[PDB]
Design a binder for this molecule. Structure first.
Ligand SMILES: Nc1ncnc2c1ncn2[C@@H]1O[C@H](COP(=O)(O)OP(=O)(O)OP(=O)(O)O)[C@@H](O)[C@H]1O
Ligand SMILES: [Mg+2]
Length: 246
DNA sequence: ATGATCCGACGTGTTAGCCACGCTGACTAGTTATGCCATGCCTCCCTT
DNA sequence: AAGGGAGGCATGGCATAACTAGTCAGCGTGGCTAACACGTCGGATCAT
């Protein structure tokens, strides 16, 4: 009969339930527990494992290079940013408010770290997330359009609840393809937040995309509902380099 | 029983004349298109 | 990579309105028929 239970558990797609079947049976036998409560505990454990696996699969699907969180961010080394605003962002009220989040400042000041932390927080609370660099997004959209499947990739870039655009400005975008980026900003406008990190000021966006009018339209659509952080201070990579040297 | 030869009949080509079919226009009737709503099937995405 | 679930789009049915096809009549043009002549094919008969 035990083999039948194991086969049924595997067939119903409950691997962990079968794995811990003997342990839970022994626990129930040793200590008297109501059947309802025992099933509640088993289903809760299965749901916890399923949630962990789903979060890991979402992390894999969302191309996050390195996993980080707010807990690992040192506000003392970066006093230019108020921790209160970051904590308010972590509440994910902007998702309901459709507000974007723009990080600006010199390289290595934690912009990417903060963006990844916000993305991880969104993923944990069950919100679909996606991470990509601006150059990669533009190149992928261009390649999809050249294949006559731009709409599919546009859906791919629009479907995520939280889209992260990292390093917008380090590499100049091809003028013939900048519009692709605008499309995303045009379709995610008032629909889903965008977390964009850059080292260039807004006035220079025209240089990045090579079209002043398109850059102005993109900025107007992006900044309509957004929270802008102007981070300052010394580079964290250089700080670590000095600490290692010293 | 088969092949060759000779004879007779039928088919074809040509020309002329006549009759029937095709085209066009008008009018009337019947069928198709379209809009709207509801249901079913196909496709896409996610999970194992 | 395969199966299951969910969502979206396409189809069908029904009702109404409009456009097109059918029919009839008249006129014009093309095809069929008839007659005659000639050539070819089929049938019959005789010989091996
Ligand atoms: N305050 C901080 N606390 C902890 N780690 C930090 C902090 N600031 C930066 N780092 C780490 O330093 C490295 C570079 O920082 P990060 O990429 O977040 O900065 P950035 O401004 O987005 O960089 P860049 O523009 O050069 O790409 C990463 O490992 C990041 O985790
Ligand atoms: Mg960075």
């Amino acid at each position: 009969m035990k083999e039948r239970i194991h086969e049924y558990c595997h067939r119903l797609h409950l691997p962990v339930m079968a794995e811990r079947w003997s342990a839970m049976a022994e626990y129930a036998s040793t200590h008297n527990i109501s059947y309802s409560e025992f099933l509640f505990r088993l289903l809760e454990a299965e749901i916890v494992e399923k949630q962990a696996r789903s979060i890991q699969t979402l992390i894999k699907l969302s191309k996050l290079p390195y996993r980080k969180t707010i807990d690992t961010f040192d506000f003392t080394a970066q006093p230019s940013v108020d921790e209160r605003r970051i904590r308010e962002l972590l509440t994910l009220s902007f998702i309901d408010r459709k507000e974007n989040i723009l990080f600006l400042g010199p390289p290595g000041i934690g912009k990417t770290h903060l963006a990844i932390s916000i993305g991880m927080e969104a993923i944990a609370r069950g919100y679909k997330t996606y991470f990509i660099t601006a150059h990669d997004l533009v190149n992928q959209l261009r390649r999809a359009d050249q294949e006559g499947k731009l709409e599919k990739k546009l859906r791919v870039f629009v479907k995520p609840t939280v889209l992260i655009i990292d390093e917008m400005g380090y590499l100049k975008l091809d003028p013939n393809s900048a519009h692709y980026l605008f499309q995303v900003i045009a379709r995610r406008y008032e629909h889903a937040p965008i977390i964009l990190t850059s080292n260039k000021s807004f006035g220079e966006w025209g240089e990045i995309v090579g079209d002043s009018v398109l850059a102005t339209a993109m900025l107007d659509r992006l900044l309509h509902h957004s929270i802008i952080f102007n981070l300052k201070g010394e580079s964290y990579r250089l700080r670590e380099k000095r600490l290692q040297e010293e």
